From a paper:
Alpha-B.1.1.7, Beta-B.1.351, Gamma-P.1, and Delta-B.1.617.2 variants of SARS-CoV-2 express multiple mutations in the spike protein (S).
Beta-6 perches atop the right shoulder of the RBD, with principal contacts contributed by the HC (520 Å2), while the LC makes very few contacts (124 Å2), limited to LC CDR3 (L3). We suggest that the two distinct classes of H3 are accommodated by some degeneracy in the H1 and H2 interactions although related interactions in the IgVH4-39 portions are maintained (considering all interacting residues of both antigen and antibody, 22 are common between the two mAbs, out of 28 in Beta-6 and 34 in Beta-54).
Residue numbers in the entry:
A (entry chain I): 334 to 526
B (entry chain A): 1 to 134, 141 to 222
C (entry chain B): 1 to 213
D (entry chain C): 2 to 138, 144 to 226
E (entry chain D): 1 to 215
Write the structure that this text describes.
């Protein structure tokens, strides 16, 4: 009947950026009006499509990628961006066609003692290809002597944790991102507006 | 209308090599990822390999690791699967499947019709037909033994006898040849006044055998 | 790797009954669980994607649920075109792994098999090979166990079986066992039995023959 | 900003120790700072107890996690501390400081408070007995022995503050009886022993005890 | 567990020189570190936060080598009022907010022999049933000193407590006081009381003694 956008944005728990979650949106009428009128998103950048002219464009499939990063990394969720999240966690293609939506979630994803449940990848041998997911936990060798699964001299764990506490600056507070990507094949369109 | 057409599947001896191909159409093939899946006769599905959008990252299964090689040619919109040193396990129906957006190998949105690969050393051979000679009702049949390759067709009385006929699917013997049995349940009173003949036809070997089953 | 366990391996239900099979994962896979339907001969058709959602064209009679490790697949009202083997597949990580599969039968009153044995023909014995055939005609359910005896010696590793698909008229199964021995070993022994065990039989039924008469 | 502690200075063993810190230089309802407690036993190192946010949640030390709770009151602009089942090893000076956590591993204490000393003992508050350390029969040494008092501290002066040069007042030691004892000595020229009088003044506020002891050379 | 080990326990340097305190973390994570200064009877003062950031009001002579695992606090020109105990503090995942063992910074000077004095118990205290004998070690350096009580040439142990003052603000020396506590009955069963002082500034152990009853 109607696309379950509620299960993505209003989810009780979000995933870490290194293991970002993708939900497939198909065979439903997609109401983007709610997202337009909603004045709670700190980011609503669309690429290849305009958000206004969206309730009249049908697509074969819609994909919603969701994760949590900090404020100064939201700028990396865009085509042609580099840093530590776009290189080791979540990379968008240059010819991206979709929207990036993000909002501040300090009241939910911050613990007073420290929220260490959200993680991000810190080391990797090469940058991620577009829409690639890496969840391996093998020790990253950054030195001459190799690492046999043990940390030490130039042997670090590939995953690191965010602090996520209410006393940080906005640049370090947790932000929930939903990346809506649209694909259009030479096939009947199941998701309209 | 995404189209995936497999080709190159056939018969090949153990240890030899074979190259399958998948012709994609109806979508930007250069952007999507590609899969290979096979399913052995009577077995379940098994993921084989996957390629990235630009054919720079490949991931296989341990069962085909170091022995299969997946490649692609974006200019020709074709997907390849180089299979070296083939064994009996590799005998399966090989499908290609479209992957995710770019390096999102975790999807299989569309599957092909699939080509079949048969790995056996035995050559084409005609079947030997032996009679299964025959309570209130009796059962008789025919043993279609030691033939290659599939399939064979069995009828009784040139199609007249159809009631109570059970033609079993063939089993692959340890010799590399196939055996098959087809039986029919008939009343005991008509065993002496009605002759039964099984009509075995094996097109690959151009063999047609009509065997008369009699009591002993 | 992530391993999937389906339950049951096969079931039988009447038309209109509620059919529910389970698929449990070796570790958390969120909701990356697919459900395939595969009729014999055809290719697998996807029915459920993302554990819960229905694929295009799939009737509302199919439904799916679960998250993490335990998943379910439910057919509220069974239909004649619903006789197939249903597989569940995870796609949280590579390699992509499938479930054991679940065959759905037409539930039929338990019918006992008609057991028949066939000595090897004299024409085949001229070639130096002997094939004894054991026939299990028209029975239900599909579960059947056949044991061979050659002079009170249980045989193993020298026999093969093949069953037919469920008959579209009587909903019974048939089984064919073939014991393959060399002519030399066939001439050293005399008694050849194929003991059958089936649910419809209150005791195992054995049919034997003596080499000669 | 300033932090002031409040609470009883004595706690019997196996009972709860309550302390309240009151700030008066900013606001506790601010969304940028934590409010914690740090203790250190006499002559020992620092040990963080727990920090509380303006909401309600907080995080403490695993050692004292079970027998501790912390509370906050934005209205009175102060936060408190509760330590259940206090043993004799909780004898320490308890500070309340301001915490600032901007990043992740960055957690420093900005402005500290002066701190209060809570001594956990069952001993009785007692004034000290002041005995003279007479100079032995150059430089001569004399002093006063301040023995058997409770609790800390005492203040010792010589000649009502007129004598400071050469004065050494030693830190007190805790005897096996539960009472403290210290000594205060002063080095004076040996020629002044017969003409200059030396008096040590001992004050113990918890017992309202003020003792002036004349230290003279002992006669045979 | 991320264990904090400061080095050294004690630092002996004089005004004008530079000190180098070491606060190495356990073979594990690496990030920020906070240094603190604490004077006697005062709350610890924040010196440096985030590896090497001077706090509001810290002179330029303080600096931190905030690098990896091992850290270092450096004081350029030691001022007279710069000698205290210094604590480094981390905030790891578990346990949160670990504190260092502390480095005591004292003013080093020339070796000074202690002036030894022994005080018999007063006649006023003997009336109470207790006898305390006091041994004084006045103005010595370094603070490492050994006091051996002897009662009738018998080495005493377990019935004595000692206390040391902080470094003198003028001559940079220490003073030690050791108190031998006996009952009045045990005190009157012996005659010779002495404390033997061994120190680096003494070529031989110095012993001061008195006889009970003799002035
Ligand atoms: C995400 O949720 C908000 C809030 O929904 C609340 O939680 C739900 C589980 C349900 O109990 C609602 O009644 C709650 O209000 C949605 O915003 C609300 O939308 C409703 C109508 O849809 C409206 O009456 C409320 O005023 C809205 N609340 C606010 C604060 O504006 C929002 O639409 C949801 N987003 C998606 C994509 O589903």
């Amino acid at each position: 009947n109607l696309c379950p956008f509620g299960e993505v944005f209003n989810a009780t728990r979000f995933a870490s950026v290194y293991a970002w979650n993708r939900k497939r949106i198909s065979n439903c009428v997609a109401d983007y009006s709610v997202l337009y009128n909603s004045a709670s998103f700190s980011t609503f950048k669309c690429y290849g499509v305009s958000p206004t002219k969206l309730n009249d464009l049908c697509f074969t499939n819609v994909y919603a990628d969701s994760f949590v990063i900090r404020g100064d990394e939201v700028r990396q969720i865009a085509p042609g961006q580099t840093g530590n999240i776009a290189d080791y966690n979540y990379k968008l293609p240059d010819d991206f066609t979709g929207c990036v939506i993000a909002w501040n979630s300090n009241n939910l994803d911050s613990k007073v003692g420290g929220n260490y449940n959200y993680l991000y990848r810190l080391f990797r041998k090469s940058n991620l290809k577009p829409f690639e997911r890496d969840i391996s936990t093998e020790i990253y060798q950054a030195g001459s002597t190799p690492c046999n699964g043990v940390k030490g001299f130039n042997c670090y764990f590939p995953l690191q944790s965010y602090g996520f506490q209410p006393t940080y600056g906005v640049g370090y507070q947790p932000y929930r991102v939903v990346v809506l990507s649209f694909e259009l094949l030479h096939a009947p369109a199941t998701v309209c507006g | 209308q995404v189209q995936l057409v497999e080709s190159g599947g056939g018969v090949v001896q153990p240890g030899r090599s074979l190259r399958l191909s998948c012709a994609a159409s109806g979508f930007t093939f250069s952007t999507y990822a590609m899969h290979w899946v096979r399913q052995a006769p009577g077995k379940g599905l098994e993921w084989v390999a996957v390629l990235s959008y630009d054919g720079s990252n490949k991931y296989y299964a341990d069962s085909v690791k170091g022995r299969f090689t997946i490649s692609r040619d974006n200019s020709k919109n074709t997907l390849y699967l180089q299979m070296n040193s083939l064994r009996a396990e590799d005998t399966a129906v090989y499908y290609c499947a479209k992957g995710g957006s770019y390096a999102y190998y975790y999807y299989m949105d569309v599957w092909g019709k699939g080509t079949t690969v048969t790995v056996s050393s035995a050559s084409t051979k005609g079947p030997s037909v032996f009679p299964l000679a025959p309570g209130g009702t009796a059962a008789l049949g025919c043993l279609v033994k030691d033939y290659f390759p599939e399939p064979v067709t069995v009828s009784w009385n040139s199609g007249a006898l159809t009631s109570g006929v059970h033609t079993f699917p063939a089993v692959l013997q340890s010799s590399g040849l196939y055996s098959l049995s087809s039986v029919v349940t008939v009343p005991s009173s008509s065993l002496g006044t009605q002759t039964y003949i099984c009509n075995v036809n094996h097109k690959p070997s151009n063999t047609k055998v009509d065997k008369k089953v009699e009591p002993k | 790797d992530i391993q999937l366990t389906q339950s049951p391996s096969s079931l039988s239900a009447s038309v209109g009954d509620r059919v529910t099979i389970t698929c449990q994962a070796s570790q958390d896979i969120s909701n990356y669980l697919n459900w395939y339907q595969q009729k014999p001969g055809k290719a697998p058709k996807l029915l459920i994607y993302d554990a819960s959602n229905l694929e295009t064209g799939v009737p509302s009679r199919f439904s799916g649920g679960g998250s993490g490790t335990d998943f379910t697949f439910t057919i509220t009202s069974l239909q004649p075109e619903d006789i197939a083997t249903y597989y569940c597949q995870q796609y949280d990580n590579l390699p992509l792994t499938f479930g054991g599969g679940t065959k759905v039968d037409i539930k039929r009153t338990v019918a006992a098999p008609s057991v028949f044995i066939f000595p090897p023909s004299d024409e085949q014995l001229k070639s130096g090979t002997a094939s004894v055939v054991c026939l299990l005609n028209n029975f239900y359910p599909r579960e059947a166990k056949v044991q061979w005896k050659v002079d009170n010696a249980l045989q193993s590793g020298n026999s093969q079986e093949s069953v037919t698909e469920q008959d579209s008229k009587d909903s019974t199964y048939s089984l064919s066992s073939t014991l393959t021995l060399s002519k030399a070993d066939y001439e050293k022994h005399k008694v050849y039995a194929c003991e059958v065990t089936h649910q419809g039989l209150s005791s195992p039924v054995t049919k034997s023959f003596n080499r000669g008469e």
